[PDB]
Structure formats: C-alpha cells, structure tokens
C-alpha cells in the first residue's frame, strides 16, 4: 500500500493533507465531525502560520476571511513587532473554523479523500502496514498513519506513546456572549493580566463578544462539568472587575495542560499537532507548532512512500519537531509562570516590561512568540530570468530549491531540486541557499557541505 | 543637645554615626552587644556600598580586610559586570563584622559616643525632644532619634509605624561548619540555584565553610525555633545533592521576609536600614539599601540641627529613601520569584539567562543588583589647579560640591558648597554638576534651575 491515513481533520490534519496532496500522495483523512466545530476555539494565526500558508499560496484564499494585525505579547506584556527589522510576517485575525474550511477545500482540490462523520475506534499496525477500525465497522488500511487527533489522541494512546508534562491547578472559562450596547464588559476589550488572573474580551460579532478567563493555582470543577453562566460572570467580576450580563451562546472550560509526546514516531505510526504537544494557548504558538509539524512531515512522508527518501529522512521528523516542540513548551511555560496572581509575580512582570523596552529584547520576544527563527527565510522579492517573483512563490510547488543570489554556483543538478538564479538582494544575508520543501534552510553560502546537505535531505544525484 | 541618638550599632547605625560625626553633630549610638557579633551574616559588599565608603575614605581603612571581586548575579543567573561601560565600582569581599569594626573605629575617631552593652527598652518624643530608656534604668535625651535597630525594630514599633509586606513560606538555614579535608560539601562551592532551591557554600577559614540553604513554598519550623545539625544536613543533601558533615559552630534560621516601613519619619523619630526595610538577603542590596539610607539621612539631619536646612529638607529623606526602598523591594522580589523549584520556574530562568546574554540586559541587571543608577557619579580622576584628584575625593569633606568640568560658570558662592574647577574629561557626561553631600546629582549642565537646586538642598545663599 502507498496510502497515508490521517487520523483527525482539524487544522493540523488538514494542513498535512494539503502537504501530502501537493506531493501527490494518496491520502485519506478520517474526521469525526460533519463540519468544523463552531464556535472557533481560536481567532488568530501567528507569523509561523502566515508564512507556512503563504509558501503554498494559502493566505490569498484567506484574504477576505479576516485581517492582518501587527500586535504581539509575552504573557500579556505588550510587544512592538513593527520595530523588528526584516521582513518576517505579522499575525492574522481569522476564526480557526474558516482556516479549517479553506484547508479542507484545498486538500480536496488536491485529490485527498476526506471522510467526515467517520470515527476511529481502533488503531493497529503490522510490518506490512497500518489498519484503523471505524465506528461503522469498516477497516481502512494504509502504509502510514498520522495521529492528528488532538490532545486526547486515541492514536497516541493506542501506540503506547507516553504524554509527559503537567496539569496545573487552573480555572479556565470561555464563551460567546450577546451583549447590549453599553455593556460593562466592553470596557475590558483586549487580553490583559489582572491582579488575580487573565481576562480576554474580544468583539466577534456586531452584538457579540468572546470572553475568556483564566486563574492559576486555584480549585476548578472537572473539565466536563457543565458551565453555568453565573460561573463565567463571577470569574469576570472577580478578575476583570466588571459586571457581565447578556445571552450566552457557547460556554466551556479550558485547561493549562502542558504536555509533549515522548516520541513522534512509532514504526508506521506518527503524531502531529495537539496529539504531539498540548501547550497553553498563547500568542498562536499552540496551533503554530502543529502547523509546522505538518509542514515538516508532509514532504518527508511523501519522499518515503515514493521511494526516493534517504534512509533516515522520516526519523528526522521526530528529531527536529520534538526539539521544536520542547522549545515551544519552554516558551509557553516561561509565560504561564508569570500569569499567576500579581501578588506573586507582579514585580518580575514589571521588570520584564522594562527589559522588553530594550530593542534586542523586544526583537527576541516578538520572534519567539511568533515562532520565528532563522531556520527559514522571509518572503523577499526576487528577480530571475523569468521575471519578478519572491522566495515563497518558489516553494509553492512543494519542491526543494537551490536559490543562487550571486554566489554563482555551477547549476546544481538533482531531480528533486529546482535551481533558481536570482539577482542579488540586500534583504537576504546569504548569496545562496538550499531550501528544503518545508522552506527550511539546509545550507547557505559560505558554509561548506553543500553536497552533504543535498544528499541528507534529497538523496544522491 | 541637639544630640542625635542612634538606636542600634549595626553597619547602618555606625555608618550614620560616621556621617553625623563628619558633619560635627553631637551623636550617641546605643547598641545591645559588647562587640560586633560573630559569625558575620554577610561576607561581601556591593558597588553601592563600595562607592559610598570610598567617598568618605573608608575603603582605604578596609584595604587589608578583604579583596575586590568582579562577579554578580540575578537570582544566581551569572552576570558579567566587567562588560559594563563606566567607571562604576565592583564588589568587595569582607566579613560584615569587620566592616562594623572599621565603621565604629571611624565614628569614635570623629568623637561620636558609642555606648555598647546598652539595651534600649522604650523610646518617646516630646515637641522639644526625644527620650530613650535603657535596661539599666537610665534616660538618654536628644533632639532626634534614628531607629537603626534591625528587622525587629523596637523604635519602629513604639513610633507606631506599620511594617507591611510579606512573609512567604520559606525554609532557610545557615551556619558555619568546621569540616574535614575532602568534605563533599566542598564540591559545591558557590551560590547556586538547584532543582529544589538554593545553596551557597563559601570557605571562610582554612577548614571552615559557611553553608546557606533556602527552599521556597515548603513548610518550615518557625524562625525562632532552634536548629539541630540534622536539619541542615538534610537540607544540603536534598537541595545541593551532597553530604554535609562536620562540627557546626553556629546554626540559625533565616526568612524570606520582604517588608518596608510605611513611613521613614514620625516627628523627631526616623528609621534606617533593616528597621526601614527587611528584604531578601541577595547580591548585596539588603545592606546596600541601608547604607545609602544612612548617607542620605546624615547630612540632612546635620543641616537640620545646625539650622541651615530648608523647611522640607528632612522630609525629603522619607520621599527619596522610601521610593528607593520600594525599588529595592521590587527588585529582590523579582529575583525570589524565580528562586522557586525549577519544576515551576526553570523555563523562565533559562529564558532570562538567554536574555542576559544581550549587552543592554547584562548592563541593566548588573547596575540593578549593584544598586547603581544615574543619581551619583563614578569616581573619575580629575585635574584641578591644585593638582590631581578624583570625584569622590572632593566628597570626603562631606560638603556639597559644584564641580565645573569646563562649563565655566562664575564661581558659585554658597556657605555649604565647595566650588571646584576641573579640566574636561570624557569619563563624565556633563560640563558641570552640583553634587549633594551624599554624592547625589542635584543639577547638571545644561539643565535650567541651578539656583533653585542650590536653595532646595542647601538653603539660601
Ligand atoms: C480555549 C482555547 C483557545 C485557543 N486559542 C488559540 C489561538 O488563539 N491561537 C492558536 O494558535 N491556538 C489556539 N488554541 C490551540 C488550538 O486550538 C490547537 O492547538 C489546535 O486546534 C490544534 O490543532 P489539531 O488539528 O492538532 O487538533 P484539533 O483542532 O483538536 O483537531 C483534532 C481533530 O481530530 C478529530 N478526532 C479526534 N479523535 C478522533 C477519532 N477517534 N476519530 C476521528 N476523528 C477524531 C477531532 O474531531 C478534531 O477535529 C486554543 C485552544 C483552546 C482550548
Ligand atoms: C543569613 C543572612 C545572610 C545575609 N547576607 C547578606 C549578604 O550577603 N549581603 C548583604 O549585603 N546583606 C546580607 N544580609 C542582610 C544584612 O545582614 C542586613 O541588611 C544588615 O545587617 C542591616 O544592617 P542594620 O544596621 O540595618 O541592622 P542590623 O545589622 O540588624 O543591626 C541592628 C543593631 O541594632 C541592635 N539593636 C536592636 N534592638 C536593640 C535594642 N532594643 N537596644 C539596643 N540595641 C538594639 C542590634 O544588636 C544590632 O546590632 C543577610 C542577612 C541574613 C539574615
């Protein structure tokens, strides 16, 4: 079998399906729900996601679904992203349900089989492949299975993969409320750290606000106990110091679980997204880390089933993304550490605000919280023989790219790699780079080791 | 009489006494102990203390009692003080008992009456004076009383000044241990943050080490209970992961108390040092803040009893030093926030450690924990008509100084101020400054308001 089964059709699963579909791999996603769930948990995507979408032309399809914004924070300490030199993306306000719809439409348009209303009840693997049982008794078979089935992943559990980390005492609530004009909660728009905990209030409709509260190190009802509107109102009054009234729609709990799968791969079974790491939802790193799992994995998986992957390519998924996941965990825990009561962390918060005043600190934190590092390039304009283009347009094909910016290499000739010569530009501080299909820089002038890079990621030529 | 009574002859009381002695004020210090106590709680003084000692020639008297060192930390994150621009002081290693001996020696040489073996039992004031009673049944009378009587200050209590702040859960032990050669505790020399808490091991004699343990947010015996050696042995094995044995010379508890007097002045009664602020003992800010209390207060009190103090000059002691105390409080609390277990603060500690690699963060933190800001100058070499000097040498007489570095003002004529003309130097970023007797800049070119500054701090010309 040459088929990849994706367990779960959330944002990470759907992104992975898009990657595999672009690569031309036979792919099936099994998703329990008949549609993306509403209301959306998330209302924004960070620089990591924006860039990874752009290098596949996915942001254009989201153009009219939301808006660019250029704000960021570290544990609700305001940062200034537009002061940061370079050309890295900023953030984008859009409900995650809409992101999911665009991703699903893209995946289907690429030939991926999407099976909604299909519950996985059982997961097995043999030396010859992968087998999943659905709630209708059907067995679906493939070469590989990827658990993108969220925090509580059935795939992770059935694979025997431990999920270590912590479940802190935390009282977290959220919901959409229809409010009247003049509603006191409208005086608390934004995400802020108050004396006792966090409260975020955001307009999501002409008469509607999303309200989120979170208080650390305090008792909380169990996560599947019903949330009465009076509980949310009491939290808002206690934390935000304002009276909430209105007509509640959605009301639910959320947790401060911070856990990561001990390994991202077990034979023919792999993990991505929330199944692989469940982190505190801050600044878009939670989804961002999952989306970048998907992009890291897609092309490696494809190369593997198509027969041209170097022996160790698929193992580099766990190696790179478990490290990246641990760094995301570290960043988000560093943040939640100072989201305790101000009686306990107020002074350190004020110190950090002061430090964030220093240009290098602001740049450091904006990049960290956006999930941005020097492993990928910015989407910079380029001029080639075929005219004007840019770095990320070269990556839309989903193929490796040797981009020569004046280093003047003899044209690299590898069946998996596209050689592109472009005029020099000051906006990239390398005269040549080798880009993996996920956009990651595998080599750059003037480093030695170009052939080893080529062979490591694409095989010999 | 017109006598200043100082309650307490610790480092802060004795420094205050030296300041008053320099200014020619009749002064008595009442101190419970027959001699500075051993063992010393502290073994180093920070940049603030070194500078304030230097501007009175006191470091000279200490030159053979210890040694300069150039290390610093923020909650045991190592810093690099020598990378910092300026001519600001570093640290000095010396037991505090010896500092006390030198300060008392200086105070006596200036004619201060130092009465040891004296228990103060009650303190009172009348419109015309202060009255303090001793355990032997005598009354000491004066014009002003200053409480330098430590953390448990009787003077603070009897003046009815509240001591708000916090007393975190904290298990702190310390003592001096005579150990056998090859003792495993010598494998842990230094002040370090471990998994569970902090431990400092410091050689203090050929076969004697000081050992200090501290663990936050765990149960502990009350601070007045006795320490058995077994308790310290367990703490060291638990925290530092090493076996301690030997013969203890002294064992006691210490707390993470962080409190500050609501006001530093109540009529003719004032507070300084630990009586004014009890902070976490870390990096030298605990003593440093007190020493600068003493230097701030001395000349102002002198001006008050000599009749040349403007009406609100003594009040400025509370305004400045309370503010400075609050900042020290905020600083040290910031630090203790990340001295919890690494299971709770490890990621934030690692992040901060990375940020401290940025030059401006390193500078910010070194200056902060050294108590150093822009309110005083460095001790820079100067060239005057009378030959070579330095900034602090001009401050040893304890008078205000109008230091003209090429601004070429007409000679300032003020009975409390010395006008000094020096050649330009690149090591001071002003062409002229007005220095208060505590070394603090009251005015600098090209600011307006030289006359106003003169009148504010030194009265009418
Ligand atoms: C309250 C809250 C607010 C948040 N806000 C943000 C934000 O603003 N920005 C941000 O970036 N992130 C945010 N996050 C985090 C973000 O929602 C997740 O990181 C993201 O949804 C992870 O995507 P995923 O596809 O891995 O998992 P999911 O979105 O959970 O998708 C997993 C899918 O698998 C399906 N599934 C599960 N089990 C089975 C089964 N047995 N058979 C078939 N299908 C199955 C589920 O139906 C689901 O569709 C927030 C999270 C919470 C809780
Ligand atoms: C374990 C420990 C380690 C420390 N380490 C450091 C360090 O490394 N660096 C640092 O800078 N700081 C350190 N400190 C803090 C430092 O010791 C204090 O900040 C400093 O001693 C304050 O000086 P002070 O003169 O205000 O009070 P004290 O030093 O407490 O002096 C007060 C004096 O008043 C006398 N007194 C009190 N009541 C009466 C009374 N009724 N009658 C007569 N006399 C009285 C006492 O005998 C005492 O001599 C440490 C503290 C502790 C507990």
Swiss-Prot record, chains A, B:
Changing residue 274 to A: Loss of catalytic activity. Loss of FAD binding. It comes from the Bacteria. Its EC number is 5.5.1.-. FAD binds at residues 31-32, 120, 274. Its cofactor is FAD. One of its GO terms (biological process) is antibiotic biosynthetic process. Gene3D superfamilies: 3.40.30.120, FAD/NAD(P)-binding domain. It catalyses: 4-[(2E,7S,8E,10E,13R,14R,16E,18E)-14-ethyl-7,13-dihydroxy-2,16,18-trimethylicosa-2,8,10,16,18-pentaenoyl]-2-methylidene-5-oxo-2,5-dihydro-1H-pyrrol-3-olate = 4-[(1R,2R,4aS,5S,8aR)-2-[(2R,3R,5E,7E)-3-ethyl-2-hydroxy-5,7-dimethylnona-5,7-dien-1-yl]-5-hydroxy-1-methyl-1,2,4a,5,6,7,8,8a-octahydronaphthalene-1-carbonyl]-2-methylidene-5-oxo-2,5-dihydro-1H-pyrrol-3-olate. Disruption phenotype: Cells lacking this gene lose the ability to produce pyrroindomycins. One of its GO terms (molecular function) is FAD binding. Binds 1 FAD per subunit. The FAD cofactor does not cycle between oxidized and reduced forms and therefore does not have a typical redox role in the reaction; it plays a structural role essential for PyrE3 catalysis, to maintain the requisite geometry of the protein and position the 1,3-diene and dienophile groups through specific interactions with the substrate. InterPro entries: FAD-bd, FAD/NAD-bd_sf, RIFMO-like. Pfam families: FAD_binding_3, Rng_hyd_C. Changing residue 31 to A: Loss of catalytic activity. Loss of FAD binding. Homodimer. Involved in the biosynthesis of the spirotetramate antibiotics pyrroindomycins. Catalyzes the intramolecular cyclization forming the dialkyldecalin moiety in pyrroindomycins, via an endo-selective [4+2] cycloaddition reaction. This is Dialkyldecalin synthase. It comes from Streptomyces rugosporus. The lineage of its organism: Bacteria, Bacillati, Actinomycetota, Actinomycetes, Kitasatosporales. The gene is pyrE3.
């Amino acid at each position: 079998s040459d088929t990849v089964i994706i367990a779960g059709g959330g944002p990470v699963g759907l992104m992975l399906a898009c990657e595999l579909g672009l690569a031309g791999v036979d792919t099936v996603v099994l998703e329990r729900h008949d549609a993306p769930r509403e209301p959306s948990r998330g209302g924004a995507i960070n620089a990591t996601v924006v860039e990874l979408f752009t290098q596949r032309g996915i942001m254009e399809s989201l153009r009219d679904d939301g808006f660019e914004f250029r704000m960021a924070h570290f544990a609700h300490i305001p940062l200034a992203p537009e002061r940061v030199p370079g050309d890295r993306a900023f953030s984008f306000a859009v409900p995650h349900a809409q992101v999911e719809r665009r991703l699903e439409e893209r995946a289907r348009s690429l030939g991926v089989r999407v099976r909604r209303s299909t519950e996985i009840t059982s997961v097995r693997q043999t030396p010859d492949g992968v087998q999943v049982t659905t709630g209708d008794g059907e067995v679906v078979e493939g070469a590989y299975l990827v658990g993108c089935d969220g925090s509580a992943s059935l795939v992770r559990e059935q694979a025997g993969i431990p999920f270590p980390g912590v479940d802190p005492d935390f009282h977290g609530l959220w919901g959409d409320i229809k409010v009247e004009p003049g509603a006191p909660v409208l005086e608390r728009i934004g995400a802020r750290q108050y004396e006792l905990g966090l409260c975020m209030v955001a307009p999501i409709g002409p008469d509607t606000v999303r309200v989120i509260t979170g208080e650390f190190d305090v008792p909380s009802p169990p996560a599947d106990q019903e949330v009465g509107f009076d509980e949310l109102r009491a939290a808002v009054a206690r934390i935000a110091g304002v009276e909430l009234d209105g007509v509640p729609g959605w009301l639910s709990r959320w947790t401060a679980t911070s856990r990561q799968a001990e390994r991202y791969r077990e034979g023919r079974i792999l993990l991505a997204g929330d199944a692989a790491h469940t982190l505190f939802p801050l600044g878009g790193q939670a989804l961002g880390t999952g989306i970048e799992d998907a992009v890291n994995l897609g092309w490696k998986l494809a190369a593997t089933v198509q027969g041209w992957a170097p022996p160790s390519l698929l193992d580099s998924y766990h190696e790179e993304r478990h490290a990246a996941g641990a760094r995301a965990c570290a960043s988000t825990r560093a943040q939640t550490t100072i989201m305790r009561s101000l009686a306990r962390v107020g002074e350190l918060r004020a110190l950090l605000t002061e430090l964030a005043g220093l240009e290098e600190v602001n740049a450091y934190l904006v990049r960290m919280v956006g999930g941005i590092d020097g492993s990928r390039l910015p989407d910079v304009p380029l001029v080639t023989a075929e005219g004007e283009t840019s770095v990320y347009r070269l990556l839309e094909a989903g193929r490796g790219v040797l981009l020569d910016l004046g280093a003047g290499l003899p044209a690299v000739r590898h069946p998996q790699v596209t050689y592109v010569r472009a005029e020099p530009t000051n906006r990239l501080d390398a005269t040549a780079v080798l880009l993996r299909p996920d956009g990651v820089v595998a080599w750059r002038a003037p480093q030695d080791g170009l052939e080893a890079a080529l062979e490591t990621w694409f095989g010999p030529a």
